[PDB]
DNA sequence: TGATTACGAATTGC
DNA sequence: GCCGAATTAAGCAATTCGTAATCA
């Protein structure tokens, strides 16, 4: 655990050693977009922008990636609803419970599973306006995603339209699975079997599969 | 409505999907028509009667013939017929996408189906009927039955159009600008409305000027506005705040123009304006549909194009706008990249390449000269274009090296007269072009005052007008109309797709006319196959005239002659031994007679085989030949219109269009040889190449050693058809119309695919041209047959061969005489290569000329020429190393960026990625960049060069060589001296010199 | 993302599990799937394979040569027969140890293999032993079943099964040559056995033990022996007349044996085997011109240059013997199998297989021998390049070229008759 | 410590 | 309340350069 100081809010970034060779550049890319970004109320609160930088990267295998936080009530760690209200987490829990067979559940978190890192491409969002901070985050998002992809083996992208050109935004090749968002109309996520494909690919690359029922909370 | 002429077709992507047509009437009124847009499927009667939810609409397409185009190998003359069926077919239209298991014709798009089934041309003039049209808004109607609305066609008429060309200039202190720190300084607009009025105006930011400076600017003639409502476009210079500037930009960009043309505006200009507008104010640029039911915000999006070669890989990127109002946002940068081939694609380079003229000196003295340009100096048209561009130009480049500032300019009735601040030059005719400016923008922004502001305003207005000049130079409107007519595509989609997409409209029309569907059953397997034949040159230096003879559209004509299509292949017969091969040949010669069936021998498909014969039918015309005939007709039309052109611009445009149609015709064959295509046919491509090789060998054998004596011409062999016997005369003696006293002999030296070089033992060019024309007429009349013709290209003097594809010569065209200037032609040499150098080219040119002069004079005592050339080269390179007077621009190479590499280590991609990581401006996936070799300044001369790719450095527009850095001359010197050595004849002294200087062994041809 | 992709990935993983025990078709499918997966997902943990060297040492250990100690658990003993070794997988072709190639097998054997694979899917691979056209089961393994019932239904199918033995031990016993001899006598099999493999119930690994001694024996002469329709096995005798067994004639060439010399040999209680691993043209011509001019090679076998005849054709047509050309159309319509076989199969290969010629040498002789034909029949021939004739086998094949052309004309003008 | 060969990449000509 | 929209790819032949792999 190391710390760095920046000019604007939250004035401090605490990071794990695995994120060492990016932090400096991040600072230089954050001091030029913070003033405009902090003119608006954002989800999440500024203090919870960089709480996924505390997690280690040397023991991760799969990354599940969105495009922006929840429009309202964001917690900082992607894809978490502590009261189990948001639609996306409910639907991902339903699909994974159908796969694994567990029937009695009251919540599901992707940050408890071992070897899985959840990520948001854009780290901030105005209240009620999806993809309203893309220009501020572009460089930071590209840099941090590229750093993540040097450690994981499979990258799972949620959103067909948003991640259409993900191969152009990355330099080194990596296994990529692009599917539908959980909250997509025309019910496309129900007929999605991406988790089994992820497990098959991992076991194809001499890697342990993922205990996808570990994230349930009782 | 009544008479309408179409401008654009565009789609809407809301909850309900529609198709829009934008058109104009004779008076100048704009009319929008809205159609429902469906998904189109083609099914049979048995499938149609068994669709559980009945389709929205179905139309009877009649009886159609379905053919299986798979290719199988046969070991004996028992060949099964092709699977052919005949059935009633239906074309069903669905509001939403449906999956049908056994649907056919699934490679064509929805817009093509709309056009072809409704009988509508994307670029036609029509006389609509209001019986089928209902008014839904002021200037917007709705059509439900497009088949009857567009039933009547009328002759084409001319309409007015509206244009906007814009440029921006932004402040920067140390590097490329950033939207979060650096503001916008200038915005320049050129504006053409429907009344033909041309207006030019520049807006200057006043937030970076002192109050006294604003007051003196207003006193000098400028206008100051504090609100959007108090701007007049009739004033050239207007100064305002940044917010008002962005609001004016937003108002201008929201209008319903026809073309908004910019140079690299989708990546820089429009993006910067949008982002700065959203930062300073919360506003957005909103586009509305013609029916006022869909509103969108401007947001540039990226299209990435991947390669079809190995490991796929991304290879190009393009940026587009997302408007839904009918306006076409055109970027000249992408168009010029996809159109022409240059070293650099910056605006200065394109201006230098396009706008050049020859000027005559009228005055000298002081620090200036006066040049004149007229139709008596360069050509008919170049002076006019130069005078057109000089109305706003500021700097002129003389002799490709000197940069000069314009003092006075006069536009005469015919040409131009310019005065430039240039040193004294001792000649009479010089070259002028529009290129770089020797100014330091960062330094000017560092100390900003009124004079610098006005100068930057002039530069920006010139940058805005260059867009219009290039728009007229490249003929984008004519090309757009031609492409929309031929390809059956909307006006906004012509310059976006490759050959596999632009040949689908004509293909669909042809299939519907012939009533044919082509299907595949099993997978496609790819094997290598051989290509054209290239002859080895017989000697290097000639000193005799060489006559060039060239076929016309060789591969399409081969396809037409043999009727080579995937559906006309009777079969392929193979054999693994001589016994079965002989039996098969004896039976095959009589089961399939020659006049109707054509049999082609080919190199075997697999290692264990010793024969392969492919049979093709000629009773019913194939599908590929008809496409080729269409494209050939278009090329002939545009060549004919080129022949009648007078001005230079029209000649250039028509030449480009005929070249485009030629390339498309060749692309059809290439697709026939492409695995992932719907027209894949291994046998057809193999046969096309085989017939081409046969034809080149026939022509070369007939021409090699041919004698013209008395009035008769004796060929080398019998003029016999190399495929089958025919009714032509095969006499090798023909009667000519040339004078009796002539006596000449003809020998063959070189050839590539559809070309033969014939040496004539003479030196004059008039007699040579006469004999060439007579010989061409005789060859066409008596030697060739069917649809094969040749052409007499030119006469080559002082021809020098180096390798099989590298030669330099002096060209006399067919319509030329002795008292005419030749044209220097280089093919494959180290002067057209884009990756060699600039120093290398100058040295090689001067030494080639010196060598030719020395051989003309001639001493060559023992090895005098070699000793002299090597000594001169040694002196020149030593002087260059010691003096270091040559700039960095003479040591710069070019390369294109992409991500299509086997293995990801790849020093090139790492270099570009590191540059992008450490620099503000980014190199994209289809961009060309400069690089050089740089080494520390303290190193001495290096003998053994160990790691060369570690010294590559990228040279940007703001690169200054450090005081501890130097150009790594050894690589350039090594390449130059290798090329010099490969030309001479001695070996021992050359090897000794090379080993003494670089410690390596030269390679020889 | 879809289910078809999921099943493609599962099939790819399954193929990747079993690669050493594979054939050409499986390799082609695996490479196609690897290319598709790399194209779709931009990166896959497996890469394309081109060599694919089959190996068996994964399931076997080093051969023992000294007495050892055994005691716990029940033991299963399986003898090792003599002959070539073949590997069989689930729905795959024939592969040879080290020199895996498509080897022809009887149709009944293929049908039995197909039915035994369809009976149960719990079979990894099968090891087959061949000894002069005597196909014998050698080894069978399974992670779920036991090597008792599998041999039971293999026996009931109709294919012979080795007499595997089951033994039990309570006390610390010493296994030596005496116990090996006792087991061999208990086997009561006259076939040559090399080693005994002892396995335990539950353990997948199999361990073999073999006993032998070194000796030097002289060579007197060479003689060939018949066992079937024009197929030969060589044999060399010594001064004492002892019988020696060898793997194949290729073993003779690789041993570089010379006339009237002495060579090393591994001798056992019952029989002995010559040891290999002691140019090629010299030996390949010396062996034949020592045994006799009337000899030529068919892979691992030797053959005459006999005159042959219509019986030599009708025997393999599975038709009643006859000598009247007119009647040669009657019995063809009597059996559907014969007519189907002759329609599907070609003419040149028919005469080639009737005369038992080799494939490569015959073809390389024909491809440099010009022919003159008329009405689909051969009427004249000549040689142009005699380089291949430097091979004595090519000359031996050329010897009966007249009978070849005669049977060729017979085949062509009878197939014309019967359409 | 050298000679020599094989492969990929960039470019131009048909 | 909390996305997604159907699709958009010519061939081979020859030369020149650097770097990695293999051979005495
Ligand atoms: C230029 C070019 C040629 N080719 C092939 C097909 C041509 O028949 C052959 C000869 O090239 P060209 O002589 O350049 O083309 P052409 O046959 O159309 O001749 P012309 O312009 O005089 O009518 O090379 C391609 O496949 N692609 C190309 O881009
Ligand atoms: Mg030509």
From TrEMBL, chain A:
<comment type="subunit">
    <text>Homodimer. Interacts with protein OPG148. Component of the Uracil-DNA glycosylase(UDG)-OPG148-polymerase complex; OPG148 and UDG form a heterodimeric processivity factor that associates with OPG71 to form the processive polymerase holoenzyme.</text>
</comment>
<comment type="function">
    <text>Plays an essential role in viral replication as a component of the DNA polymerase processivity factor. Excises uracil residues from the DNA which can arise as a result of misincorporation of dUMP residues by DNA polymerase or due to deamination of cytosine.</text>
</comment>
<keyword id="KW-0326">Glycosidase</keyword>
<dbReference type="GO" id="GO:0006281">
    <property type="term" value="P:DNA repair"/>
</dbReference>
<comment type="similarity">
    <text>Belongs to the uracil-DNA glycosylase (UDG) superfamily. UNG family.</text>
</comment>
<dbReference type="InterPro" id="IPR018085">
    <property type="entry name" value="Ura-DNA_Glyclase_AS"/>
</dbReference>
<keyword id="KW-0238">DNA-binding</keyword>
<dbReference type="GO" id="GO:0016799">
    <property type="term" value="F:hydrolase activity, hydrolyzing N-glycosyl compounds"/>
</dbReference>
<dbReference type="InterPro" id="IPR036895">
    <property type="entry name" value="Uracil-DNA_glycosylase-like_sf"/>
</dbReference>
<keyword id="KW-0234">DNA repair</keyword>
<keyword id="KW-0227">DNA damage</keyword>
<protein>
    <recommendedName>
        <fullName>Uracil-DNA glycosylase</fullName>
    </recommendedName>
</protein>
<dbReference type="GO" id="GO:0003677">
    <property type="term" value="F:DNA binding"/>
</dbReference>
<keyword id="KW-0378">Hydrolase</keyword>
<feature type="active site" description="Proton acceptor">
    <location>
        <position position="68"/>
    </location>
</feature>
Automatic annotation (TrEMBL), chain C:
<dbReference type="Pfam" id="PF05941">
    <property type="entry name" value="Chordopox_A20R"/>
</dbReference>
<dbReference type="InterPro" id="IPR010267">
    <property type="entry name" value="Chordopox_A20R"/>
</dbReference>
<keyword id="KW-0235">DNA replication</keyword>
<protein>
    <submittedName>
        <fullName>DNA polymerase processivity factor</fullName>
    </submittedName>
</protein>
<dbReference type="GO" id="GO:0006260">
    <property type="term" value="P:DNA replication"/>
</dbReference>
